[PDB]
């Protein structure tokens, strides 16, 4: 759960990431495939080689949903259904590959932010990022 | 763990250029109040009601510094985390009962506080280092449970 | 998050049970404190020791806050703002004992209800249970 | 994980009692149910899409009968846990990459599936009993990962 002080946490500092989001998020999807292999599993698909274009587009697909988050944070099950379809119904992704995911978001996040990345501004990050794994997870519509 | 000579030298390289005692100050405040239960086991440092509180407090401070020596120790061991762990997972265990996941927990917040402070130097790769290490000393630190 | 079934399973379930619930949740504990004999230290103050009027009358207590549960499933954060300021800013409850008590109540439930305790209603009591101790380790009233 | 003979012996009298391949039927189904993503490991099987579906499935019985043997095999080895299951460890962790948190799952769907059927004899002593033993039996088949 989510306080209100967490949600404007939230809500500012995605803010000032601002359009750096999606560059970001590939960043992050590089640092799970490289510190946790076993999740290049789900992306066989792809060119997961660390700079490629097709991370650099699935960067782009991931940040603009967690800003759909960011926009729903009183009600994430309605604004994400159908990716709760997608990750839980469809693909049936092991939940620790979110905990890998969050990690390394804020591992990105720290890097870019520096001293901006409080304490309080993490703990209000790491409890969006898991609220949105439990959500993606969920078998509810 | 088995941590390969380029994963070593890539945790190694790094460590030459962090200052420990700020690692460990960081680590744990942000330990403090990202996973706020873990302060049970800190009551006596003083109020950690706040973020504020947590992060100026010296206890907090002095017992940081002291885990990340304890953890620059287990860098010159790497091939012994269980016996150089030992006493502290006896310790922590059998006297403390810390639930092992918090050992994992506290491992990533070092990692976080590296990537704050040296961002170049803290690439995908070497990340990926410093994940198996800590991993590692978490396991060892736990091996009283099994 | 729950699905509608869930929730359906949930209160259909816990309405069977009805009266039996604190005798239910008082074994519960019991559970918990034979099989996790960590958890003892959060009940220092009172006897533990197995059938005890303490274990009972607490059991009782927890029981009434899983009724309220049932009854505010659309929101459990308004609901158990209260209990949520116990477990979590008070007494500062690592969330792996709300694991441990939740496999407890499980394992009670299924020896008491047998055939009735069936995989699909296992599974919406334990997202329901799941849910609970995500409210009560919260902080964020 | 070290058990005392008191709990061997809790373990081994209910054991005794114990219809191995359909607590095992059991085990297996309510984990595909209650944590579906575990489903991925088993597409070959068939239709995993429902509950009524998973507790129908041919395979599913006879695969959970074949873990329970397993396990009723470590059950001949439990000062040797770790060596007994040495070879599913290679195959569980290097081959199929499962998660240790789900052997940890598994263990309580059978604990589930002991009360479900034996209530009488699954006391509070006795189910903490077998809470050591299969948490001893997934930290071995975890073990590759350490
Ligand atoms: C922050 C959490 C996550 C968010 C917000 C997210 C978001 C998305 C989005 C927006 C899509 C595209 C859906 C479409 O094109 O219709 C997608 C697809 C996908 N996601 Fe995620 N995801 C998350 C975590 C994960 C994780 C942890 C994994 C596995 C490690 C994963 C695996 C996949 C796969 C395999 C696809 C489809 C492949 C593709 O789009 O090319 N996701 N995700
Ligand atoms: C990287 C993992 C960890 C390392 C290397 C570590 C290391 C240490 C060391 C070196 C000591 C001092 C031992 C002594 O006084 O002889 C200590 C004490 C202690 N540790 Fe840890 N620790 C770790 C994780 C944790 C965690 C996760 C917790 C709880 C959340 C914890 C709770 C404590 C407590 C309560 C003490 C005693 C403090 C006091 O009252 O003086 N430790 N640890
Ligand atoms: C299903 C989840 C739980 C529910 C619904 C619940 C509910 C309650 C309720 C209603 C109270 C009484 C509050 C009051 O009297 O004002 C209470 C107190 C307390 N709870 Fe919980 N609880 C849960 C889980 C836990 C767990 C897992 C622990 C620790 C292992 C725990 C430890 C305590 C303690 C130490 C108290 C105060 C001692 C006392 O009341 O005598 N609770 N809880
Ligand atoms: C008590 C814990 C477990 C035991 C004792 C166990 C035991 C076994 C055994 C005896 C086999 C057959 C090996 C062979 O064919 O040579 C097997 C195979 C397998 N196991 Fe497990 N297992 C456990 C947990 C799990 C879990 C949690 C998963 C995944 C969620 C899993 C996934 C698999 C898969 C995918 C196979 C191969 C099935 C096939 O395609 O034939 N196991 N396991």
Redesign the pocket.
Same mark, same amino acid.
């Given at each position: 759960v989510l306080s209100a002080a967490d949600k404007n946490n939230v809500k500012t500092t995605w803010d000032k990431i601002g359009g750096h989001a999606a560059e970001y998020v590939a960043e992050g999807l590089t640092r799970m495939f490289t510190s946790f292999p076993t999740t290049k599993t789900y992306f066989h698909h792809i060119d997961v080689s660390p700079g490629s274009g097709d991370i650099k587009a699935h960067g782009k697909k991931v940040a603009d949903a967690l800003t759909t988050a960011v926009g729903h944070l009183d009600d994430l099950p309605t604004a994400l259904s159908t990716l709760s379809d997608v990750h839980a119904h469809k693909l049936r992704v092991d939940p620790v590959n979110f905990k890998f995911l969050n990690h390394c978001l804020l591992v990105t996040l720290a890097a870019h932010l520096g001293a901006d990345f409080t304490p309080s501004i993490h703990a209000s990050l790491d409890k969006f990022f898991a609220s949105v794994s439990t959500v993606l997870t969920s078998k509810y519509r | 763990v088995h941590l390969t000579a380029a994963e070593k030298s890539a945790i190694l390289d790094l460590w030459g250029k962090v200052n420990v005692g700020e690692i460990g100050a960081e680590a744990l405040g942000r330990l403090l109040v990202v996973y706020p239960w873990?302060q049970r086991? !800190?009551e006596?440092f003083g109020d950690l009601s706040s973020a504020s509180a947590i992060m100026s407090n010296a206890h907090v401070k002095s /017992?940081g510094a002291?885990?990340l020596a304890? !953890?620059s120790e287990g860098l010159k061991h790497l091939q012994d985390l269980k016996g150089t762990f030992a006493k502290?997972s006896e310790? /922590?265990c059998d006297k403390?009962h810390?639930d092992p996941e918090?050992?994992r927990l506290?491992?990533n917040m070092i990692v976080i506080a590296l990537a704050h402070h040296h961002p170049s130097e803290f690439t995908p790769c070497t990340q990926a280092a410093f994940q198996k290490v800590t991993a590692g000393?978490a396991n060892a630190?736990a091996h009283k449970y099994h």
């Open positions: - | 873990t086991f !800190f006596k /017992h002291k885990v304890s !953890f502290l310790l /922590h403390l810390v918090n050992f506290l491992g000393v630190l």
